[PDB]
A paper describes a structure:
Thioredoxins (TRXs) are small oxidoreductases that contribute, in most living organisms, to the control of cellular redox homeostasis. Indeed, they reduce disulfide bonds on numerous proteins involved in several processes, including antioxidant defense mechanisms, photosynthetic carbon metabolism, and protein folding. In addition, TRXs have been suggested to control two additional Cys-based post-translational modifications, namely S-glutathionylation and S-nitrosylation, by catalyzing the reduction of glutathione-mixed disulfides (–SSGs) and S-nitrosothiols (–SNOs), respectively. The redox activity of TRXs relies on the presence of two Cys residues in the conserved Trp-Cys-(Gly/Pro)-Pro-Cys (WC(G/P)PC) active site motif.
In the present study, we deepen the structural features of CrTRXh1, providing the 3D structures of both the reduced form and variants in which catalytic cysteines were mutated. Regardless of the reducing activity in which TRXs are involved, the N-terminal active site Cys (CysN) is responsible for the first nucleophilic attack on oxidized targets. While the subsequent catalytic steps underlying TRX-dependent protein deglutathionylation and denitrosylation are yet undefined, the reduction of protein disulfides implies the formation of a mixed-disulfide bond between the CysN and a Cys on target protein.
Author numbering: 1 to 112
The structure:
Amino acid sequence: GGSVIVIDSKAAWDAQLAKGKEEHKPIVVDFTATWSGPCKMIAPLFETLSNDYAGKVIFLKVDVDAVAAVAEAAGITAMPTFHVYKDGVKADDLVGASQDKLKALVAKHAAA
């Protein structure tokens, strides 16, 4: 129950990145896997933050095994990974399930 946009394909990924560019809003992405406990531990927080920052920050989810072409091009190797995209390109990242660092990352880019 939040505002996260699920990415199903490279085409969908490219469209969302272009939307963030056109809107001048930052995108935060959770690259996640069903088999990762840490991903499960932080997924509820990602969803809550998508509500708290609705209208300000765009939240995407990429299941790395469902959309392997996007995970590979993004250079993912540990789960969860969070990226921030601005102007169609990567601007920031976090790897791991630190709730404090995720909250701070979203706050930073919402305030920038």
